[PDB]
Amino acid sequence: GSESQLSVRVTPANAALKANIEAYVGSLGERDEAALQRFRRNAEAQAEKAAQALGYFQAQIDSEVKDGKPPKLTLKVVPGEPVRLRQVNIQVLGEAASLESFRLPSGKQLKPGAKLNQGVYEDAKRLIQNQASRYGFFQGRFSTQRLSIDPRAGIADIDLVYDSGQRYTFGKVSFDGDSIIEEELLRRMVPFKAGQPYDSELIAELNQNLQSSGYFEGVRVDAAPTQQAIPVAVRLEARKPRTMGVGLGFSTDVGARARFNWTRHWVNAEGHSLGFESEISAPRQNVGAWYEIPLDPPLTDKLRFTSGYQFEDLVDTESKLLTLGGEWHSKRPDGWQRVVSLNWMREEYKLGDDSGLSSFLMPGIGYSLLETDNKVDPSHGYRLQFNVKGAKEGLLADADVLHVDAMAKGLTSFAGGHRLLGRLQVGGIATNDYKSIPPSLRFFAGGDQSVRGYDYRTLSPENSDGDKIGGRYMIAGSVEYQYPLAERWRLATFVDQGNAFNSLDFPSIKTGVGFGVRWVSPVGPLRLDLAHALDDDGGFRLHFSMGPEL
Ligand SMILES: CCCCCCCCOCCOCCOCCOCCO
Ligand SMILES: CCCCCCCCOCCOCCOCCOCCO
Ligand SMILES: CCCCCCCCOCCOCCOCCOCCO
Ligand SMILES: CCCCCCCCOCCOCCOCCOCCO
């Protein structure tokens, strides 16, 4: 069996108190009568702690033991009337009294009439002192601290008066270390000026800033209140000038896969970045290079020049694609990153048996947004991506083009860890010469991340002879439910719908449904799905994939 039963009866009923007592007492285990009898004093003790945490200081607690199958330790309890706050005086004086973002202790638990809960008082005090320390009120002193309780007549008074005194400020920022990065650049990624009101989260922001620039392998950003201005000392350890990286992966879409990167994290004092990268899979190989120049602000604004070469043999198309490009990234405080681009490309291609070659110089604008709990175990978050590019034939273009692609990903956790995943992707290309439009600019659907139940890029318009050539438009959507089965183990069920097509009037949407297993393994998030195609002649398909959900 064999677990012994614990029964808590409160008169009158009080579900809160009951559940609390049940959690505090814990599990009885597989204890027999004698063993339950030894356990009684612990049981009553725990029960009265549990009562005290909810404000009941006059709870009558008694315990019965009854042998049986299984044995039963019954707790009977008369709550009595609890302790309620009468007077509550929480005051923050000094400069902090006028500071906008200084949270005062608030809420139901501190309203007069509320049952006094364990540690709401200490919570209030901790909050006040934590914000005091965050905002540099280091001379902040509690002038009054009083929690007063009379269990008889059930009254409690809280008195917290906090004289905050003057607010400290940021002193000068100093930089030392074997970094060749000019201080001109380093100072433009300091999220505060000197003589500006102190904020420890700005120190943190500085820390993460320096860390994310890629320029160093270690940063020491420290400045304990000292010396009213706090000087800030930053020491920087220059990163290794060059770096190599290798990755292995697998997919149902493309199979075994190898990634390589060769990065140069600082080329010069002005913070330029160099890079090389490649990936090899049986159906697709590509190589790319890039150069980056920080603008202002250095971290959210930059120029990125790129080049690339890519071979692809997939389904019924082949393509050798060459590309050069200039990009201008800027990100607003939302998290909205805009990318203004000018890209030139040349594509050698075979659609079915028809060989084409066309080239385009195209401008584009993109918007991105990523908001998550993060970062490997996101419990909720979302990704938004919008991208439009276009070309004018004559102006270094073999055809006219208006290419649009958009994606939205979303994840939510609700209840006891049940997840819901939502996915939408849309694409469209307008042109006056579809035959001149190469594969990379056409749209395809189906696959692990597209419409499961269907092989990668197989959902597509076909020509006279039955070859999948690419759509003028596409949609792909999915809804997935995940059930937590263990730590690192989830059980999913999903529905995907989508297609690539040439006519808005005949989308011919295909549907896949199925279920799979998710595992946060020692090599990354693994997903294994079994999917049934409902449309065309649908059999079954095994999908496998790795990488973050978002
Ligand atoms: C999650 C582990 C990461 C895997 C890294 C690379 C492993 C490469 O997997 C090899 C898989 O080979 C078995 C399937 O390959 C057959 C594909 O079709 C062969 C053509 O007949
Ligand atoms: C845009 C957010 C709402 C869209 C959800 C439903 C999408 C409707 O199906 C789209 C299929 O057509 C593809 C074209 O969509 C993008 C615009 O086309 C650009 C061509 O000018
Ligand atoms: C993802 C965007 C939403 C698209 C909505 C339009 C859906 C159009 O097709 C719906 C067809 O019905 C779904 C199932 O069809 C398969 C037929 O056989 C099912 C037997 O179980
Ligand atoms: C994409 C559509 C998915 C909808 C089908 C779901 C079918 C599976 O049913 C799951 C029922 O689970 C009930 C949840 O209760 C479990 C609670 O225990 C764990 C959390 O405490």
Automatic annotation (TrEMBL):
Top-level taxon: Bacteria
Compartments where located: Cell outer membrane
Gene Ontology biological process terms in this record: protein secretion
Cited InterPro entries: Bac_surfAg_D15, BamA/TamA_POTRA, D15-like, TamA_POTRA_Dom_1
Residues of the POTRA domain: 168-227
Domain called Bacterial surface antigen (D15): residue spans: 249-547
Domain TamA POTRA: 7-79
Keywords, sorted A to Z: Cell outer membrane, Membrane, Signal, Transmembrane, Transmembrane beta strand
Cellular component, GO annotation: cell outer membrane; TAM protein secretion complex
Gene3D superfamilies the record matches: membrane protein fhac, membrane protein fhac: a member of the omp85/tpsb transporter family
Quaternary structure note: Interacts with TamB to form the translocation and assembly module (TAM).
Recorded family membership: Belongs to the TamA family.
Protein's recorded name: Translocation and assembly module subunit TamA
